[PDB]
C-alpha cells in the first residue's frame, strides 16, 4: 500500500531509537502494539518523549508533500 511505502520512508528520516519507538507503538514490525510503559522500558524513554516522537511522526505522515490523495 502507498501508506506502507510512505510510512517506511518517514521512518527512514528518524533516528534508530525514534523509529523503534514508532514501530513498537503502532505494532508495525510484529503486529503487536506495545503499551507506553513497555516502550519506555525497551528504549529508556519517557511517556512524554514517546508522545513527541509520535506527534512528529504523525505530522510527517500527514504533511501534504507525502499526501495520498
Amino acid at each position: 500500500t502507498l501508506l506502507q511505502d510512505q510510512l517506511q520512508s518517514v521512518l527512514d528520516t528518524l533516528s534508530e531509537r525514534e523509529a523503534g519507538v514508532v514501530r513498537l507503538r503502532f505494532g508495525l514490525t510484529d503486529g503487536q502494539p506495545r503499551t507506553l510503559d513497555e516502550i519506555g522500558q525497551v528504549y529508556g524513554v519517557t511517556r512524554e518523549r514517546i508522545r513527541q516522537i509520535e506527534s512528529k511522526t504523525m505530522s510527517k505522515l500527514r504533511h501534504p508533500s507525502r499526501s495520498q490523495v
Partner: protein
C-alpha cells in the same frame, strides 16, 4: 480537496521538517517557505495545520515555532 494542488508534492518532503542542530534552521525554514509562497492552497494548508494541531514542520508558509506562538 486542496491537497491535490499542493506544490510540495514535487519536493523532498524532509524540506518541510528542518531539525534545529544547535540552533534555528533559518535557511531551511526559508527554503520551505519559498515553496509555500508559490503554492495556491497556502491558506487552506495553514488552516488545516492549525485546526488539527500539527505541531512539527512547516505548513502553510509558517514554521512550527510560529504556529505554536499563535496558539498560546
Amino acid at each position: 480537496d486542496w491537497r491535490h494542488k499542493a506544490v510540495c508534492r514535487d519536493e523532498d518532503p524532509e524540506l518541510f521538517f528542518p531539525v534545529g542542530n544547535s540552533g534555528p534552521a533559518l535557511a531551511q525554514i526559508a527554503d520551505a517557505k519559498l515553496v509555500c509562497n508559490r503554492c495556491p492552497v497556502t491558506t487552506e494548508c495553514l488552516s488545516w495545520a492549525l485546526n488539527t494541531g500539527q505541531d512539527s514542520g512547516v505548513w502553510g508558509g509558517m514554521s512550527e515555532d510560529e504556529r505554536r506562538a499563535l496558539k498560546r
